[PDB]
Each structure stands twice: as structure tokens, then as C-alpha cells.
Amino acid sequence: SHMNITVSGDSSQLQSGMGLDKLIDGTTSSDDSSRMDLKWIFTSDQQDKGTLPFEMTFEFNEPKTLENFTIYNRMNSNGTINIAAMKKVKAVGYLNGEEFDLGEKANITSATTVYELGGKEFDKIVITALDSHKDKNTLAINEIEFYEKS
Ligand SMILES: CC(=O)N[C@@H]1[C@@H](O)[C@@H](O)[C@@H](CO)O[C@H]1O
Ligand SMILES: [Ca+2]
Numbered sequence: 001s002h003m004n005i006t007v008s009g010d011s012s013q014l015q016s017g018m019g020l021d022k023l024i025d026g027t028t029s030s031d032d033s034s035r036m037d038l039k040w041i042f043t044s045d046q047q048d049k050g051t052l053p054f055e056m057t058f059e060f061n062e063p064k065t066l067e068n069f070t071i072y073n074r075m076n077s078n079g080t081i082n083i084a085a086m087k088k089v090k091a092v093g094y095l096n097g098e099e100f101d102l103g104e105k106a107n108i109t110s111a112t113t114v115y116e117l118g119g120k121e122f123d124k125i126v127i128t129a130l131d132s133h134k135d136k137n138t139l140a141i142n143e144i145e146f147y148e149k150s
Contacts, residue, residue: 003148015040015048023056028072028143030082035074037084038132038139045054049137052128058146062094063123065149072125072142077132081109081133082124084140088131093122104130119149 038050093097
């Protein structure tokens, strides 16, 4: 049906008003109001910054069998990937403490990054943004969606 997801991670890395909740608020557009962003850089001497790698933890209140999860990347209006978007990501799944390497996806250029899970069962998934298209202090993600196996 509808699947309750809890997201956690270091909110001190993120831009005000653009926190972890924006990963699961049901907004997949690239608008500022939809996204989770690492702290924006406002001045040339700013020392308060977020840094990659950035780890995002997703938990379900009970194990779920998943078809996939889908990361929605920040895109420009012309369909090209924005400079602040994710470029490289890895993920790990857990079930009863057992750890499962879900692998890394690199050179991301598309509107979505999809981890096909083929009905594997997890109670926790940890997604780590490793690189963006700009620098290690920049990251924008529109949404991350989880699709349950029937
Ligand atoms: C118009 C535009 O793209 N503004 C971006 C902002 O969205 C965010 O990425 C910020 C991070 O420092 O940098 C700006 O360049
Ligand atoms: Ca969103």
C-alpha cells in the first residue's frame, strides 16, 4: 500500500529549509522548494559548509521487500543535469544486522538514478552521495522514492 519511511542523517550539513524531509515529501521536481541541498555557499570566505560524502539513512518500521529505490536528480529545464546534482552514489542495505552491498553508480547524468533490487528484503537502506557535478561542498537531490514488491 503506502509505505512509511523514516530518514535520518546529519542535518547540520544541509541548507536551512532544504533538509532530509525534502527527500520524502512527495516532490520530485527540481524546484528549490522540492529539494534537499547541502549548505549553500553565500560568501567567498564562508567556513560553515556541508561536505561529501553525505550519508542518508532510510528505515522502515518492519522489513520490506523492494523492487527498487529511485533517486530524482536536480535537472535543468532543458533536460541536462544541473551542476549541483549528484554525480556518484553508493548504497548499502541491512536486514537483521546482515549487510548487503548494493553497489555504486557513477557518472550520473539522468533525471533518475534507479537501484533495481529485485525484491530483496531490507529494514534499512543507507545511501551515500560521494560526488556532485560541482565540488565536494555541493549537492542537490529532489526526492528518493522506494517501490515495494507487490
Ligand atoms: C540558481 C542556482 O543554480 N543557484 C545555486 C543553488 O541552487 C545552490 O546550488 C547553491 C549552492 O551553493 O549554489 C547556487 O549556485
Ligand atoms: Ca522532494
